[PDB]
């Protein structure tokens, strides 16, 4: 009977309804191995037309009309469900199949405020207090979290829903996981890295959940439940299991071994490649992990999962885009890859910053065109928001700050590719530069993040301001005498006044001068920093700075050439610079004995070398004594000569200038040209490229 | 030289030592310089001696790190970036960065 | 007291002498996750339970006080930790060195030995174990299905729980690997092999269907008396569906690392990641081959290793190619790198196919690896050789033998590339490969290019040139039938062996070749024809005496004249034939315009045509009188008309480097080829577009 | 544009018996007195025999696409098959190599 197809699919998929979202290739259980469902709709066939008839049905409103009102329903229900899911037709009748992803849940968005509002409202159910421990947990508030969960797990058999109590249960095992690591973590480590012993969670709640959690196996869940339940929800069965996202594993890696072997061939795959097996899986997973209210931000398990997943996509598409053609290829070959919003929080999200690095490294992401702008900016801005209005008080929570940090970072910098408008970028550039965290972000580190974000967006007058006051605070903060700034990039605070005049080249401060205006010579250690900062002041305010701090060190020496005060040289600085190497060498000929190689990070001498290539420095007593580096062999005697000194990495480490003025010499250049040749070809690099292209032939 | 070097973390304030661990890996990425050195070592243990919210603070202390391999490495001011991952398999790996001053520039000194 | 220590060890791996190999990984469940035994021996703590022991090891004077039962099982653990390889502490460690030793003759390849044990009297059970492996590895299946069967019945009355629980699991997967054959042998392998061959009837696939019914893999352990489920934990992991799926992970996670170091150029210190992999891939060896195991039935294990293997040489290869500051130079400067040695020469023959060996080169470079060992590769390749010609010099062959074993043949024989042999072993080789292997896998195009790799570092004495003779002779006598043609998948035919020849022995003959062409008519057509292919190798008499038959009337003849060097200098009605080809193919060509066919043929007559238009010797007006819409000619008649490409890109990789050379002796492409040649230097990585760019451009 | 999914018929050669349909998944091409040197490997998809036909030898293969009629032929092709028999498992892919007689040095047609 046509009538009595839907009879057999309700009686087997009856009980999934009770979810909010499960996997296509998870439904190969539910129906006990009887038909194969692509991760991209299409059913496949592995003694009765069974899935045949149903699809049938929906094409042809003619044969469905025959139906009772309870068939009707039944029906409704399974064509609304399946159209939540994704299933589609046969592949026989397949057709165009484009799928996009929409994750249904204010978690992987990152509303915290509309997360409170939620929470500070009135409970209505079960399913409302599982949403609201999910939230209370990723909002970093663990005890309610794990209260509520108690509480849930407590009265879920006397509400009569089983799917609740097991995903309850699994929940409040996972975050017990994460408050025991967490305690562990802060114990012994946390002394040293946040410089403080702090354990919000006091020696009560650990002694009652060490006990509570005892003798409970992730394992052995589902076996010790009603059978009813065993054969309703074996979907659910995969959860319970210690060695748990193993498949997906394992998978990715055969896919990754194919792309791979079909990326050295040069293949021509047809239809669904293997690629996009990768992307539908990666989101049949992430929709099905976060629509269910599961705790798995505690795994660094899912982000090697989704950060594989998305290095491979990344790697795949850039093949396709530098890759060769022939004619048999044009005769099949004759789709590209670009970013959207939810691409963007998923990088945010599960990668670290070696990890974009690597990224950027082996691929190129500029080439990777971006869209749905809109909601990058409202994301960015609201992540912003955040950091500003949490740092901005007396209060901060530090399970939540490790959990969040790290993707306000991942996103601060990823911002890069997205253009922005005023507005935003505004708020995004006050929230860095006024209230992140100093031990995350050095002003080395503050400084790169500022200037990469340049790259699309310019320099309006509104960001020219704010760095004008983080400039103000940093001259109030060096009025101490005990204060002293540390980088971990070479780049200080000298570096946000090249920036402003980079774009703003006639540019001066009116909070700067007063500061420098109300100076003594017994105000030192402000001095020493406003010498940094000469081209941003007046220069009334200029000659008033230079008259307290003459030219005396080194340092003030190069950094009165570096801001370019001296143009010119003047007499009696060959004097320091003869003896700064006088003294090395005095120091030299006693280590000798000694034995130190002391290959300091210091590069004052080879700068000196450069200066004396470029014939600004020349003089006979600069090569009476010669130090211990290397790389005087270029500019003292480019004929005696050694292995290397540190040319390989210099020719990168150069500018154009000095590359071109290095071509135009006399034997050098076979060398060069030799060990040019040897890093290309026994290597990969375009820089090596570059500079056997241009500057060499 | 040998392959295994031990490495030794010290607070720049007296000298007492912080922890002792063994090396695993480390990274080396007018004119200037852009470098960056990234140290990671393997479990170590804290001194017994030295164990006994958040505000955008830097009120922090500097640390120096000595690798022992005689090959003397010495790095004056390091930094370590510890970074929160909790895991599905529950049952110590320590990173750092080597920092610079502006004024007395020295990120890396060996002596042999 | 000190003499109590070795009571708990006993107390807890006692049963774990019962088997061959153990695996140091796979020790944390039989002291219940107590310490940490690394990969590479030492252990680490997470009282002093190992410690004492360990201590008593240093220290004869302190086990002198044990009594005779102490002393023998303080004898039992030391030697078992010796065959294992457990050594000392981690905090007491120091120079490390690990070599492996599989000790099975199945892995050797030693078919002889094997048929002559099997062929020996039975002495226990675990001769009988033994002898079941064999007879499946040497794809004897029904009486390894019977011989698995009798010993399963046979284990209980023996009291030997672990052969039990082993033959059971080793006959399920003899079971699915008849049943697998029998599927694939009946679709797919009527056409494969050109018939319907099914060695196993009807009465054994319907006993052994029934016998398996709900015979699942997993709950085997927990179906077990609970002493053994305490004593044999170690097994437990055998006993599951999704196996050799941990490794895959850890594999994984070890690949993960090892990129990332490379990609950030990083300085790994003591045991690296890729030291961990090769020890993981060498553990995992040892444990399943040495204890009988049926895992040839596996693909997944073949790609474990497939992995291991490729991961291991391409970080050889970073590690060879690197580029190095002063501080790698200083750590690594004596380069103690990778080398190959036997035991890897023979996991990359039994466990990569051609592709993957070729995936492997083109990312690799394998010349540059030294091979050590190599009496034993030698001898390995000889027995191969031996075997095959063994089994396929008389009326018979092991079919299902034949496919588990020609793959292995195959990779051996493609890998011996690298290995040097002697003058005996590498003319076996070469006679079991040119008269013995089966021609449904190696045509004549695979089988000239698999000679002729073995030539890059052995040349070509004189038993090779007889043996090629032969082969010749042979070929020459199969083309005495009128209705005979040799088809090639990679263009390369009969007259290849000739060249080869030529290129070792330009002055050389055949005193067998010039009867068979002594003795030809008119008629004999399909041989003439053939033997015009190998003319430079004949008689001069023979030479005038064939080309007194058959004249150049056709264009594959003049071609072929070219070819074999029989027409230095350009003869009359020479072009006449090349105009008109040239003509009929536009003639063809503008009737089809309507109908709109493409027709890219494989043939490249039109190619060369304009190649040959470039060196002036046919030089002529006629030639540009018509087109046949081919880009390639567009390079030999107009080179200022162009267009987007020809098939330039892919032919400054064809040409060779004459052609090259004139190329950057020209006007106005060469500037259109610079700037193709940087985009494609640019956005890729291939060594050949760096080729031309540095040595025929500048 | 070509729907990137084309169909593949696998016939006999000397009679013309079709043997079997298939969709196409894999094609790979590698490459004075010149010389060829070019090999194809085709890759199906699941594929079932003709009924006739389960009741040396030469093979013809037929590729049919549209671009929005496109025509693939290779007359002379060899089966490679190969025996990987696996874990878990309970239709398989097959691979065929372009062959090229010695008369006709022809391998790969394309028909618009």
Redesign the interface.
């Given at each position: 009977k046509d009538d009595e197809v839907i009879d057999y699919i309700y009686g087997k998929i009856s009980p999934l309804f009770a979810l909010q979202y499960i996997r296509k290739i998870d439904l190969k259980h539910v129906f006990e191995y009887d038909y194969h469902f692509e991760v991209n709709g299409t059913v496949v066939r592995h003694g009765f037309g069974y899935m045949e008839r149903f699809f049938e049905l929906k094409e042809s409103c003619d044969e469905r009309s025959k139906l009772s009102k309870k068939q009707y329903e039944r029906f409704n229900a399974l064509f609304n469900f399946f159209e939540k899911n994704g299933v589609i037709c046969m592949a026989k009748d397949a057709g165009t199949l484009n799928t996009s992803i929409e994750i249904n849940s204010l978690a992987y968005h990152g509303k915290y405020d509309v997360m409170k509002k939620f929470i500070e409202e009135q409970s209505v159910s079960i399913e409302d207090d599982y949403k609201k421990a999910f939230f209370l947990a990723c909002l970093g508030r663990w005890e309610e979290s794990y209260d509520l969960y108690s509480n849930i797990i407590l009265n879920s058999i006397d509400e009569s829903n089983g799917c609740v109590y097991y995903l309850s249960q699994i929940n409040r095992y996972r975050i017990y996981?994460?408050i025991?690591?967490?305690v562990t973590?802060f114990n012994?480590?946390?002394?040293?890295?946040?410089?403080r012993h702090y354990k919000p969670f006091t020696d009560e709640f650990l002694a009652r959940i060490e006990r509570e959690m005892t003798n409970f196996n992730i394992d052995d869940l589902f076996n010790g439940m009603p059978f009813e339940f065993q054969k309703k929800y074996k979907i659910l069965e995969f959860l319970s299991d210690?060695?748990?996202?193993?498949?997906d594993?394992?998978k990715?890696?055969?896919l990754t071994?194919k792309v791979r072997?079909?990326m050295?061939?040069?293949?021509?795959?047809?239809?669904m490649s293997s690629d996009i097996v990768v992307l539908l899986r990666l989101y049949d997973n992430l929709r099905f992990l976060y629509e269910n209210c599961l705790w798995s931000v505690?795994?660094?398990?899912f982000?090697?999962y989704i950060r594989?997943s998305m290095s491979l996509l990344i790697e795949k598409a850039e093949y396709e885009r530098?890759?060769?053609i022939?004619?048999?290829?044009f005769?099949?070959?004759?789709s590209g890859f670009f970013m959207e919003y939810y691409d963007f929080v998923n990088i945010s999200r599960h990668f670290?910053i070696?990890d974009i690095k690597?990224l950027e490294?082996?691929c190129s992401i500029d080439k990777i065109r971006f869209g749905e702008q809109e909601k990058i900016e409202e994301y960015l801005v609201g992540i912003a928001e955040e950091i500003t209005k949490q740092?901005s008080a007396?209060?901060?929570?530090?399970v939540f700050?490790?959990?969040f940090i790290?993707e306000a970072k991942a996103a601060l910098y990823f911002a890069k590719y997205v253009k922005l408008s005023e507005e935003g970028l505004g708020k995004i550039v006050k929230a860095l530069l006024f209230?992140?965290?100093?031990?995350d972000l050095?002003i080395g580190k503050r400084y790169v993040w500022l200037e990469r974000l340049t790259k699309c967006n310019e320099l309006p007058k509104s960001i020219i301001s704010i760095i004008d006051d983080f400039l103000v605070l940093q001259a109030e903060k060096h009025i101490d005498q005990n204060y002293?700034?540390?980088?971990?990039?070479?780049?200080?605070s000298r570096d946000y006044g090249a920036l402003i005049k980079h774009f703003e080249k006639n540019f001066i401060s009116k909070r700067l001068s007063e500061i420098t205006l109300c100076l003594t010579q017994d105000k030192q250690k402000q001095i020493?920093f406003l010498f940094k900062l000469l081209p941003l002041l007046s220069t009334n305010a200029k000659s008033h700075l230079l008259s307290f701090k003459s030219v005396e060190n080194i340092?003030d020496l190069?950094n009165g050439?570096?801001i370019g005060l001296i143009d010119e040289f003047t007499p009696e600085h060959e004097e320091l610079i003869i003896e700064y190497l006088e003294t090395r060498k005095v120091n030299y000929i006693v280590e000798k004995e000694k034995?130190?190689?002391?290959?300091?990070?210091?590069?004052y001498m080879?700068?000196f070398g450069?200066w004396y290539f470029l014939e600004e420095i020349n003089n006979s007593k600069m090569e009476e004594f010669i130090g211990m580096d290397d790389q005087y062999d270029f500019f003292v005697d480019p004929e005696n000569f050694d292995y290397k000194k540190?040319i390989?990495?210099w020719l990168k480490?150069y500018n154009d200038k000095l590359l071109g003025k290095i071509a135009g010499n006399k034997h050098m250049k076979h060398h060069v040209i030799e060990v040019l040749?040897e890093?290309?070809?026994?290597?990969?690099?375009?820089r090596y490229?570059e500079i056997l292209?241009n500057y060499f032939? | 030289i040998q392959d295994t070097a031990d490495v030794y973390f010290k607070r720049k304030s007296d000298g007492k030592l912080?922890f002792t661990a063994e090396a695993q890996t480390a990274s080396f990425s007018?004119?200037?310089?852009?470098?960056?050195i990234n140290l990671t070592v393997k479990n170590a243990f804290?001194d017994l001696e030295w164990?006994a919210?958040?505000?955008?603070?830097?009120?922090?202390?500097?640390?120096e790190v000595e690798y022992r391999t005689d090959i003397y490495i010495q790095f004056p001011?390091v930094?370590?970036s510890?970074?929160?991952?909790?895991?599905?398999?529950?049952g110590?790996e320590?990173k750092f960065?080597?920092?610079?001053?502006?004024?007395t520039?020295?990120?890396?000194?060996?002596?042999?």
């Open positions: 996981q994460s025991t690591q967490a973590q012994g480590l946390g002394l040293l890295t946040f410089g210690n060695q748990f996202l193993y498949d594993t394992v990715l890696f055969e071994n072997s079909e050295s061939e040069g293949s021509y795959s047809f239809g505690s795994f660094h398990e982000h090697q594989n530098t890759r060769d022939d004619e048999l290829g005769s099949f070959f004759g670290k070696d690597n490294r082996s740092f007396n209060g901060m929570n530090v700050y490790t959990q790290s209230y992140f965290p100093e031990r050095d002293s700034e540390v980088s971990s990039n070479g780049l200080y020493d340092n190069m050439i570096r034995g130190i190689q002391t290959f300091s990070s210091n590069d080879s700068t450069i540190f390989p990495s480490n040749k890093r290309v070809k026994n290597s990969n690099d375009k490229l292209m032939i | 912080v007018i004119l200037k310089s852009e470098k960056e804290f164990l919210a958040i505000k955008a603070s830097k009120f922090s202390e500097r640390y001011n930094s370590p510890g970074e929160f991952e909790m895991s599905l398999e529950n110590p320590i960065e080597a920092l610079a001053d502006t004024d520039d020295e990120m890396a000194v060996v002596i042999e």
